[PDB]
Amino acid sequence: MGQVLPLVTRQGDRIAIVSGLRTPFARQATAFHGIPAVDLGKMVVGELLARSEIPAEVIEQLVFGQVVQMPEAPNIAREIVLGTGMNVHTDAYSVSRACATSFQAVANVAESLMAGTIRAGIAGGADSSSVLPIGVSKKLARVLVDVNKARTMSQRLKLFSRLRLRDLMPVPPAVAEYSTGLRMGDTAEQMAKTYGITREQQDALAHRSHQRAAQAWSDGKLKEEVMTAFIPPYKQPLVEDNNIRGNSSLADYAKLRPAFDRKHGTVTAANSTPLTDGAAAVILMTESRAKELGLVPLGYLRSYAFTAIDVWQDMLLGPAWSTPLALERAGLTMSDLTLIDMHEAFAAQTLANIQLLGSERFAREALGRAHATGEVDDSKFNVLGGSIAYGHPFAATGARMITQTLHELRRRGGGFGLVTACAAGGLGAAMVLEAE
Amino acid sequence: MEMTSAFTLNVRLDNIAVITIDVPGEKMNTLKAEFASQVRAIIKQLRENKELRGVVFVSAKPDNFIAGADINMIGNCKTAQEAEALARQGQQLMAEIHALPIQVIAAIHGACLGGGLELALACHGRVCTDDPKTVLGLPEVQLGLLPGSGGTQRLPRLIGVSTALEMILTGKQLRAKQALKLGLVDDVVPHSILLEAAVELAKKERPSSRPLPVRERILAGPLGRALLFKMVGKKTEHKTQGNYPATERILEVVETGLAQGTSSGYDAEARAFGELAMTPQSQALRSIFFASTDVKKDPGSDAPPAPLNSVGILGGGLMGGGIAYVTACKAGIPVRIKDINPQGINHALKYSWDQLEGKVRRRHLKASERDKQLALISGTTDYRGFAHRDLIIEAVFENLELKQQMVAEVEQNCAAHTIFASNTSSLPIGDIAAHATRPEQVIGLHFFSPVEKMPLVEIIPHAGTSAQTIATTVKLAKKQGKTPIVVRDKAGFYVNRILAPYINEAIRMLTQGERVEHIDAALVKFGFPVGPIQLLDEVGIDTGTKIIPVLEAAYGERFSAPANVVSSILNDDRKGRKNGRGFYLYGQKGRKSKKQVDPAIYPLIGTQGQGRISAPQVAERCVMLMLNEAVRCVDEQVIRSVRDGDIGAVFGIGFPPFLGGPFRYIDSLGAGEVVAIMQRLATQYGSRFTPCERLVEMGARGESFWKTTA
């Protein structure tokens, strides 16, 4: 046991996982327009509780988090508890770890739950890219603070005397990294250039992802994971994801302008996930608690790992670093791993990641491990499509993968799933799931 | 084969051929006669198998594309004929390369300096990587030699004279973005796709459309060339004082090329290069270049160094901020300041902040870079956090017992393998060590305020100093962008030791009714930047007197200064810029003229009689003072090597580069002729001009200085 660490509780019970749920995702203007990020989580949590046999008193703590953040109600988990119908004695709590927020929420709940302080909790994430907080210029905030603190009337006019230029214009939000000024996609262009990913090598991944997802809806296999959102206008319900376009031919979107480079930009809009709105949640519960109240567990949890890398070149290699650590912690091997998953926030970067996990030199020098972590079969990789299809709500794409993977292993009747994700700031996360 | 023909050809599957450049000697890609021969064979072979898309050039080395033309072979020339022949053949070869009808592309990565741009300007299209290491530029005027091979007249045609002229005259470095904006390079790409991007740029056929210039460059030939040339000539005459050749020659050759055709420019450049490489300034500058390269490659001590990752500074203020800024912003080493007063820490931090904010206001650094660099500097007022510092630099007042106290407590409250560096300028290093637990790890790191300005530092060991300590200190000084020099532990060290007679004789002459303009012009005309009195004003009169009392105490009356001049200013505190109320008043109307001289300073000093003699007398007397002092100090093996002393003198004090340094100056002046000059000066003036015994010995016996110099 030089590397394996079990994830068991002090009593000897494993961390079971019970049902999860996912609001259907939408583009940033079609539906959910004007709907804040809090009430999406309210929807999913409230109707997740009102779907199983658990009384609301069992839940003892819920953790959400959101990347795009509204200044009002900083601790959105408390408003999730208060607004919906729940015991007001639940320890609401909020985290934030960029695109891997839901993974961190699940990890926090799991470790606190195996510490003994909790017996059941909720972990999830909500996100909305349609209620963007549009702040005013930085200069036109010190003026406001001073005039609030200004004492005499003549002082205020002398203060506004410095108000000039275009300080009135609002400041658009920035997706570029705070300390790097890189637009999170132009850090994928150079990755594609470095590892040699062709616009024809990709743009076939996007096609195979739009398929196996349109097919997934048509088969209805993902029926029990998706709500049927109802919108306060109540003009018509939303049942299916509208981002999915599983009808285009691969020769249709080969003719698109490059997005960032615009000169040698082997990545474009179609092969990159768009900003969406959604929410997701999962109910974590220890095995003993689930057993004693009569509930079948939807799989379990095996191990997890988080890693950071330098944000100056190819910061999007998080899964490559995280995966071997998670495997060694679970005492497993890539060979004995039925089905895997990847965030695929962009075409390439994911392909670069497979190339790297297949490369012996990378694991030889950049990790110090003797052997490469193995290659991934196409069939055992993103069986039900990926984020180049559904969409990418920053804080919600974590739990969605756990739910989908557990259900798919339920269909295959066994195996150990694996989920990985990369995040801005060079943060990567991975975890190994076991569906009994 | 592969070794000789560094220009290996390789035709890919398509109609494109790639040529690598791998000189098997060393990591710089230099130009030699063998390359000039072999490229003819390669291009003749390229003439075979016609009907191909084009050719490209690649560096095939990780660091640079082409460093520059080798200068070692240039030193083997004898007359103007050899240089003209070499220039003619280079011009012909570049013209031949430019004479191909197919697309020729230069894919440059890393450094491309000197004659490389020539070849780059020979090609029809150029592409450069975006790495901050790569750079474009012509650095041969600074070597006192025009880069005549064709680019001297191609560059003004490609890009307007408004920039090309200042590129040639002041050969500098160009960023990739700057070149792209200016029109020198067609496109910029990341290093990964460099070869490929060059390939499809070659595949596109014959861009028969010259990009338009600013349209203000149409002045050349008709009215407008004359005005611009006259103005830049007057500017250069006011700036360099006209003692630097290869400045008006450039203007003439550019004029001839522009207003008389390209053939006229070619022949004029050939003749000028032939006649100009033999001017004494040329080999003087080449000698300084060689010496600087050697000292940069010099390892100092012969022992392996020790790891260094953190550094401590005791004391603060303007100076401590200087060392902190140099060690953090340049070398990127964490630095911890330990001023006892929080005001000192605040002063040091403010100094560094002012420097970096001034840099950013130019828009040369990102605002995030300021934070990422200031993160390395942290102050305190206690001894916590000093337990893992490899180096400590001491920069508080020079009281002896105070320095023993400092060394005692740094021994008590720090590591065991750490070494202690003192920024002392007066007290002996051994005496500062005296009694200590580990005296073998005490060194003297003499700086020159302002620290970021003068690039010379002094390393002073003492009787017991482990070679590892010297090695570590030298490597640090190298990382800081300085020029380390090892100096024997003697009173007065080297630089200020020879600087003292300069200001001493300046004051002695000023006492004899001399005016500011005469003295200042006399000293700056002899290739000296910033003449004496404003040198003192810059460094501060309070530091101007320095610690010369110890100089007299060590070496008699030779260094004795006239009285009632240093005394007459310290009492009526006139510190120049330290108190502001120097004799160079500030805040004058307009603030666009020479610094005003006070009228009352002459009455304040004795100012006896009226001035005499002329500027040549002033120059010769001051210069021979420095020469006698320098030969005196090198006589007793103060400086380990002749070149070390010469480079220190020329590069820290500000000795005229075109004279090559004091030792070059005496070698050029030769022998006992200057000796007779200095006896006659002594007889007419006084006993201060007694020649050194080794000086008269060498002059009479006719020995040389630079090995087999003569």
Side-chain angles (χ1 to χ4, degrees), chain A residues 2 4-12 14-52 54-56 58-71 73-145 147-163 168-244 246-260 262-436, chain B residues 4-34 36-43 45-49 52 54-91 93-209 211-214 218-224 226-233 235-268 270 272-295 298-360 362 367 370 373-400 402-545 547-587 590 593 596-663 665-666 668-697 699-706 710:
Chain A
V4 65
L5 61 83
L7 201 64
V8 75
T9 198
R10 295 182 175 319
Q11 325 297 111
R14 304 175 288 123
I15 301 316
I17 189 167
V18 188
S19 65
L21 208 53
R22 171 172 79 87
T23 293
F25 299 154
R27 300 219 201 78
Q28 63 153 345
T30 62
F32 298 164
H33 190 64
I35 303 302
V38 186
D39 63 358
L40 291 148
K42 278 155 60 66
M43 293 177 70
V44 58
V45 176
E47 191 276 331
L48 165 63
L49 277 296
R51 188 179 287 273
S52 63
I54 62 170
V58 179
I59 296 320
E60 293 179 353
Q61 159 195 17
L62 62 83
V63 187
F64 287 179
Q66 65 182 357
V67 176
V68 65
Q69 44 168 7
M70 65 180 288
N75 177 28
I76 78 159
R78 201 49 192 170
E79 295 62 29
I80 300 299
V81 167
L82 294 183
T84 75
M86 292 183 58
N87 201 353
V88 287
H89 300 331
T90 43
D91 304 331
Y93 175 69
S94 165
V95 310
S96 170
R97 192 216 186 79
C99 316
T101 308
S102 300
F103 284 179
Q104 183 62 255
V106 169
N108 292 332
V109 166
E111 63 198 9
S112 82
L113 188 153
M114 65 180 288
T117 187
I118 305 299
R119 263 147 76 75
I122 311 288
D127 189 358
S128 166
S129 66
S130 174
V131 287
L132 277 296
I134 301 299
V136 298
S137 77
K138 302 286 316 313
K139 187 269 183 182
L140 183 63
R142 290 188 38 184
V143 170
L144 277 296
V145 159
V147 65
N148 184 18
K149 304 286 288 303
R151 179 70 275 172
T152 190
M153 295 299 102
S154 73
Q155 201 152 350
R156 314 162 99 94
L157 61 87
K158 296 189 283 288
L159 169 66
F160 290 102
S161 72
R162 292 183 291 113
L163 188 136
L168 277 296
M169 287 270 102
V171 160
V175 66
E177 182 65 26
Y178 195 65
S179 64
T180 316
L182 283 197
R183 277 176 309 123
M184 186 66 204
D186 62 358
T187 182
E189 264 176 354
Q190 63 84 30
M191 185 180 288
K193 292 159 149 144
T194 302
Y195 304 83
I197 298 319
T198 319
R199 201 180 183 211
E200 276 71 16
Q201 193 163 42
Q202 77 197 35
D203 283 23
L205 181 89
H207 204 248
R208 89 168 282 278
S209 171
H210 274 255
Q211 322 312 100
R212 313 164 76 101
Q215 211 279 337
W217 291 97
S218 79
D219 198 12
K221 41 185 61 179
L222 61 83
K223 182 63 69 177
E224 55 272 19
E225 293 83 3
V226 191
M227 293 177 70
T228 304
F230 299 108
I231 301 299
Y234 293 111
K235 307 305 293 293
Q236 58 100 32
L238 190 141
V239 55
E240 262 191 349
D241 292 331
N242 52 0
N243 189 359
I244 188 166
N247 206 5
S248 60
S249 59
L250 73 165
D252 186 74
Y253 63 90
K255 45 182 73 62
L256 285 174
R257 296 295 86 193
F260 319 105
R262 294 179 66 188
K263 285 297 302 299
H264 318 84
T266 176
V267 75
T268 179
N271 48 25
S272 82
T273 187
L275 72 165
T276 51
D277 315 320
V282 176
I283 305 189
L284 273 299
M285 185 180 288
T286 198
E287 173 199 75
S288 304
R289 183 52 177 259
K291 182 73 168 63
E292 73 179 4
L293 64 95
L295 192 42
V296 59
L298 188 69
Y300 292 96
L301 192 44
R302 202 52 195 274
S303 81
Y304 63 94
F306 296 84
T307 301
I309 50 181
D310 186 74
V311 60
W312 272 117
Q313 291 254 331
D314 309 70
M315 66 182 179
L316 300 196
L317 295 175
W321 295 75
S322 296
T323 306
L325 183 63
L327 272 296
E328 83 170 286
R329 270 183 187 161
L332 272 188
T333 316
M334 185 64 73
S335 85
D336 291 331
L337 197 78
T338 289
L339 194 142
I340 71 167
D341 198 292
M342 294 299 291
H343 175 30
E344 57 184 85
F346 276 89
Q349 63 84 30
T350 175
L351 286 158
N353 277 277
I354 296 89
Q355 166 195 344
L356 286 185
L357 306 103
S359 78
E360 183 86 10
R361 186 253 316 147
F362 185 90
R364 176 66 36 75
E365 54 92 11
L367 276 72
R369 306 176 174 284
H371 316 96
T373 176
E375 68 269 59
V376 298
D377 186 74
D378 172 9
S379 69
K380 294 185 291 182
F381 162 75
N382 277 325
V383 175
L384 282 71
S387 307
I388 307 297
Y390 307 131
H392 177 45
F394 296 109
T397 56
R400 155 180 84 75
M401 290 184 237
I402 297 89
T403 62
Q404 288 179 5
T405 315
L406 274 296
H407 278 118
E408 196 46 45
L409 274 71
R410 185 83 274 152
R411 262 81 64 83
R412 268 87 182 282
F416 295 77
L418 185 148
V419 189
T420 63
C422 66
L427 294 174
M431 64 184 73
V432 163
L433 303 159
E434 170 207 7
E436 186 67 27
Chain B
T4 63
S5 193
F7 297 157
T8 304
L9 192 139
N10 181 19
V11 172
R12 310 144 56 81
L13 187 153
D14 50 355
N15 265 357
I16 279 293
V18 56
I19 295 90
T20 49
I21 302 170
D22 280 328
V23 285
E26 61 85 20
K27 277 74 69 177
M28 295 299 102
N29 291 30
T30 65
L31 282 193
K32 273 84 65 180
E34 192 270 346
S37 83
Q38 294 302 319
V39 70
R40 262 89 56 80
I42 287 297
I43 196 74
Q45 185 263 339
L46 191 66
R47 285 293 204 183
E48 167 63 89
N49 186 59
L52 73 163
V55 285
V56 291
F57 288 106
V58 285
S59 166
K61 253 188 190 157
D63 62 358
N64 61 2
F65 174 61
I66 171 168
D70 177 76
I71 63 171
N72 300 293
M73 65 182 179
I74 314 183
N76 280 354
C77 279
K78 267 68 58 184
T79 79
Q81 283 82 355
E82 299 88 337
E84 292 180 353
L86 192 149
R88 283 298 208 191
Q89 73 91 41
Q91 293 179 356
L93 200 153
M94 295 298 102
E96 185 273 349
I97 292 297
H98 188 72
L100 279 192
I102 72 180
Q103 280 316 102
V104 188
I105 301 303
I108 62 170
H109 154 70
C112 168
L113 279 295
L117 282 72
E118 286 276 335
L119 187 153
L121 276 296
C123 302
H124 318 78
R126 301 143 301 266
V127 65
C128 64
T129 190
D130 45 17
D131 198 285
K133 186 180 289 293
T134 198
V135 74
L136 277 296
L138 287 332
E140 291 296 293
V141 60
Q142 86 172 10
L143 214 45
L145 183 63
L146 61 83
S149 168
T152 78
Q153 59 185 356
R154 280 170 186 135
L155 202 42
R157 203 74 52 79
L158 181 135
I159 186 53
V161 297
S162 47
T163 59
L165 183 63
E166 61 86 20
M167 299 282 327
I168 301 299
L169 294 174
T170 62
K172 58 164 188 170
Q173 309 305 319
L174 264 291
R175 296 294 86 193
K177 182 67 181 294
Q178 305 182 316
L180 157 72
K181 162 192 307 179
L182 183 62
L184 183 63
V185 58
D186 293 293
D187 186 74
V188 289
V189 295
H191 177 65
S192 179
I193 58 166
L194 166 70
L195 174 54
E196 320 310 312
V199 160
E200 69 274 15
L201 183 62
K203 281 178 170 310
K204 188 269 183 182
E205 180 56 37
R206 179 70 275 172
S208 292
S209 194
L212 73 165
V214 70
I218 64 174
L219 58 84
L223 184 144
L227 182 135
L228 188 153
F229 280 159
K230 184 166 175 58
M231 295 298 102
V232 298
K235 182 67 181 294
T236 306
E237 294 294 328
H238 166 43
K239 182 67 181 294
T240 199
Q241 307 313 300
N243 57 4
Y244 264 91
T247 67
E248 80 286 352
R249 319 289 282 144
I250 291 302
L251 268 66
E252 293 145 22
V253 75
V254 168
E255 186 267 355
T256 42
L258 265 294
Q260 267 81 20
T262 315
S263 51
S264 311
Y266 271 126
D267 60 59
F273 189 95
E275 62 92 8
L276 192 147
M278 295 296 172
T279 308
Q281 292 81 304
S282 178
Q283 68 269 18
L285 277 296
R286 289 207 316 281
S287 49
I288 297 169
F289 182 76
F290 277 135
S292 74
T293 47
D294 277 11
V295 76
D298 185 74
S301 173
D302 46 355
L308 73 165
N309 290 318
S310 56
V311 72
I313 302 189
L314 299 180
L318 278 165
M319 72 292 291
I323 309 101
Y325 162 77
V326 164
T327 318
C329 293
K330 299 298 293 295
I333 307 278
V335 54
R336 187 89 177 282
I337 316 187
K338 197 206 169 293
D339 194 302
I340 62 170
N341 197 4
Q343 294 304 324
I345 307 287
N346 183 59
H347 268 91
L349 265 61
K350 177 176 176 298
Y351 168 83
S352 185
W353 161 270
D354 285 319
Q355 214 81 30
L356 273 188
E357 191 295 329
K359 265 173 80 167
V360 162
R362 186 268 186 189
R370 290 185 292 112
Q373 294 201 30
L374 267 298
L376 279 300
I377 309 163
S378 53
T380 176
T381 179
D382 63 358
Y383 271 112
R384 277 209 299 310
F386 273 114
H388 278 57
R389 305 290 175 172
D390 291 331
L391 196 51
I392 296 91
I393 296 90
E394 189 276 331
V396 66
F397 176 76
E398 53 270 16
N399 173 270
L400 185 55
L402 189 151
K403 284 175 153 25
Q404 281 90 20
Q405 167 63 39
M406 301 288 106
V407 72
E409 57 190 43
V410 69
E411 172 58 33
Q412 187 63 271
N413 305 341
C414 184
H417 66 268
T418 186
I419 62 170
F420 181 87
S422 161
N423 191 0
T424 189
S425 178
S426 297
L427 294 174
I429 300 297
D431 186 74
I432 277 169
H435 60 279
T437 81
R438 261 172 296 284
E440 59 274 12
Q441 288 169 339
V442 189
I443 193 66
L445 182 62
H446 189 281
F447 271 101
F448 292 84
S449 71
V451 185
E452 69 275 16
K453 299 288 95 176
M454 283 73 74
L456 183 62
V457 305
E458 293 179 353
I459 323 298
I460 311 159
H462 67 98
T465 312
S466 162
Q468 192 174 185
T469 301
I470 297 89
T472 52
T473 300
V474 166
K475 96 190 293 194
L476 182 63
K478 281 167 182 283
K479 294 181 176 67
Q480 293 179 356
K482 300 305 200 195
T483 300
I485 284 183
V486 170
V487 162
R488 280 308 286 276
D489 184 27
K490 300 284 207 301
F493 304 144
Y494 175 49
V495 175
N496 63 187
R497 181 198 216 263
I498 62 170
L499 181 54
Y502 181 76
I503 62 170
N504 199 343
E505 196 69 25
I507 294 314
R508 288 191 186 284
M509 294 177 70
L510 188 153
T511 48
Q512 291 144 47
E514 295 296 332
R515 307 267 83 98
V516 64
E517 69 275 16
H518 182 277
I519 191 66
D520 213 328
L523 277 296
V524 298
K525 186 175 175 296
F526 206 81
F528 264 119
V530 57
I533 62 170
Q534 69 275 17
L535 182 63
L536 282 72
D537 292 311
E538 190 277 331
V539 66
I541 301 299
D542 45 349
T543 50
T545 181
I547 193 66
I548 58 171
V550 76
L551 277 296
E552 288 95 9
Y555 311 114
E557 194 267 332
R558 190 171 70 241
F559 295 103
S560 54
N564 71 84
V565 294
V566 58
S567 301
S568 75
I569 296 298
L570 268 294
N571 52 5
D572 168 38
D573 47 352
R574 181 165 264 143
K575 318 302 183 220
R577 311 285 90 84
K578 299 298 293 295
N579 54 0
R581 50 149 277 148
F583 56 89
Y584 278 173
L585 271 298
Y586 283 181
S593 77
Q596 58 266 49
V597 289
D598 267 338
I601 50 181
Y602 293 145
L604 182 46
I605 321 295
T607 300
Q608 274 60 53
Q610 197 51 255
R612 267 86 164 169
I613 74 171
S614 195
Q617 325 277 313
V618 191
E620 68 209 9
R621 63 196 287 186
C622 295
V623 160
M624 61 79 71
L625 267 297
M626 283 74 74
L627 294 170
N628 201 348
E629 182 65 26
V631 65
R632 189 79 32 83
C633 65
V634 70
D635 175 87
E636 57 255 9
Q637 306 92 31
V638 159
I639 296 174
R640 60 169 60 253
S641 292
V642 59
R643 53 103 167 169
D644 291 331
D646 186 74
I647 192 66
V650 65
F651 183 76
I653 297 89
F655 212 72
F658 57 91
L659 294 174
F663 294 147
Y665 193 86
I666 56 189
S668 83
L669 267 296
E673 44 266 44
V674 62
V675 181
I677 294 320
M678 66 180 288
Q679 288 91 21
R680 70 177 178 87
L681 290 172
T683 51
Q684 69 197 91
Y685 264 100
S687 163
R688 300 151 317 279
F689 311 152
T690 45
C692 166
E693 281 71 20
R694 185 176 288 273
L695 187 152
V696 298
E697 187 273 331
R701 196 164 287 117
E703 287 180 7
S704 65
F705 263 93
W706 287 354

